[PDB]
């Protein structure tokens with residue numbers, strides 16, 4: 551299998567760890583881990599284009615969108631490659647992450663390694679919020695924590 | 704051109720920003736930036752195999768060595784792909800980094816993106832130190848700061 555990993559950190563209480571595994575070349579990718587320090591509710595969860603955190607999470611740019619599509623949710627045909635939806639935190643501030651996605655990859659054209667995974671302030675409206683920004687970012691707000699996705703053993 | 708970047712941080716005071724640019728496909732790579740919080744002198748500077756910083760810089764594994772060679776310096780034929788030698792800190796505690804390297808790449812099998820850049824405790828002896836460990840790590844000691852190398856705009 552191919553494996554990757556991301557340490558999420560930022561300028562506040564939000565921290566996390568997210569693991570990735572892809573059993574077959576170009577096959578589905580399992581994404582799992584835990585994020586703590588979150589306000590209760592939904593937090594947008596995306597791979598952004600660049601693995602640049604020079605000035606913090608802002609430096610990562612827009613969602614990873616190699617195919618020039620509008621923002622959506624992971625189950626949509628019309629989505630960014632980086633659109634992984636939301637993670638959901640309880641009152642404990644913890645979101646347990648367990649996702650399988652067939653659009654991201656750990657090899658090829660849609661490869662997410664070397665790019666930034668970001669957990670956002672607010673909910674991602676999955677492109678259904680009614681303004682143009684919904685179709686770009688899902689109105690998920692600021693970047694609470696992030697890290698560069700790296701190759702794992 | 705193709706560009707990459709790495710933010711260095713650790714348990715202590717060492718912090719850095721390192722930029723990479725590769726003008727031509729498969730061409731040499733320019734590596735430049737600054738690292739502060741260092742003791743004066745030489746500090747080993749390497750790309751390590753894994754972009755895994757789960758438990759800190761130790762998680763990054765050994766020097767990146769896709770071609771199964773021994774450790775050396777950046778101007779040696781016999782070196783690991785990750786062997787970028789030493790950076791040098793002055794009495795300001797800052798290393799002003801400006802390297803060109805013909806072995807690392809930002810694509811292909813020598814791609815360092817998604818892997819970890821590490822700055823070490825002590826000098827790298829470039830494989831000339833006279834023990835077995837010289838030929839593996841250059842005796843450069845602990846990992847002061849590191850980051851996962853990401854794709855840049």
Ligand SMILES: CC(C)NC[C@H](O)c1ccc(O)c(O)c1
Nearest residue numbers: 571572573574577578579580650
């Ligand atoms: C190592 C275990 C905890 N990971 C889950 C498993 O490797 C996996 C599950 C679903 C997938 O789509 C996958 O590529 C890989």
Ligand SMILES: CC(C)NC[C@H](O)c1ccc(O)c(O)c1
Nearest residue numbers: 677678679680681682683684685
């Ligand atoms: C502002 C632009 C993107 N137009 C909004 C679009 O006509 C629209 C209307 C109703 C909806 O429910 C919606 O998600 C999107």
Ligand SMILES: CC(C)NC[C@H](O)c1ccc(O)c(O)c1
Nearest residue numbers: 724725726727731732733735803
């Ligand atoms: C902005 C400056 C630092 N760019 C350096 C230049 O793009 C460059 C110099 C030497 C090289 O080998 C290279 O790939 C690229």
Ligand SMILES: CC(C)NC[C@H](O)c1ccc(O)c(O)c1
Nearest residue numbers: 602604609708722735736855856
């Ligand atoms: C990607 C942007 C935000 N960073 C540019 C980088 O900080 C930089 C550009 C030109 C330089 O000469 C330099 O030392 C450093």
Ligand SMILES: CC(C)NC[C@H](O)c1ccc(O)c(O)c1
Nearest residue numbers: 740743792793794795796797799
């Ligand atoms: C800031 C402390 C560590 N003093 C550094 C000193 O003023 C200094 C400045 C510039 C240098 O190049 C240097 O070697 C030493």
Ligand SMILES: [Cu+2]
Nearest residue numbers: 595596668670
């Ligand atoms: Cu995002």
Ligand SMILES: [Cu+2]
Nearest residue numbers: 748749821823
């Ligand atoms: Cu090293």
Ligand SMILES: [Zn+2]
Nearest residue numbers: 613621630633
């Ligand atoms: Zn998106």
Ligand SMILES: [Zn+2]
Nearest residue numbers: 766774783786
């Ligand atoms: Zn080495």
